[PDB]
Amino acid sequence: VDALPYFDQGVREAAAALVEEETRRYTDIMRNEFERLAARQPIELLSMKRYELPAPSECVNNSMAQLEHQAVRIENLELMSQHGCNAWKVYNENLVHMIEHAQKELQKLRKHIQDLNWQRKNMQLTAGSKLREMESNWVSLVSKNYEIERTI
């Protein structure tokens, strides 16, 4: 389990082959039905392709539709312009308050994680020394036990 990242400063292609060799060894209603069918089939349901084309010389109705629609557009255009005319930028003001809040979080997350990493790093250097102390003492016995036997 234990593998020191910060301390171990000192093969990937080699170790990959040895790991490779051990792997050689080893809730909605009807809505959901038509939505999943539309995505699976890759086909969007056709809308009213009628209003744009039409033809001069049933059309008494189609004409009276157009007049009302045009009136609504003027009414909507005035309403839309009226909203756009003063609001045109109101949304932008709100969108800038919404954006800056996300990047404040980005910093708060950035600061915690950095601290954690630093902690880990510091922690390592502690033990890597202790392991260095152990190995030096290990090599001392190794030759000490020999030089004791050589003389006997």
Partner: protein
């Protein structure tokens, strides 16, 4: 957070193993001297 916890685990146990590994090495050092020390007794 969890990575830090993992590192913590990693530390406690690595050293204690090497610590006990060092204790045994000291014993072989501690005895091998005595046989050398007993060379002077026979003289």
């Amino acid at each position: 957070e969890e990575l830090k916890k993992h590192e913590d685990s990693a530390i406690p146990r690595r050293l204690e193993c090497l610590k006990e590994d060092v204790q045994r090495q000291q014993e072989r050092e501690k005895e091998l001297q005595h046989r050398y020390a007993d060379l002077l007794l026979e003289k």
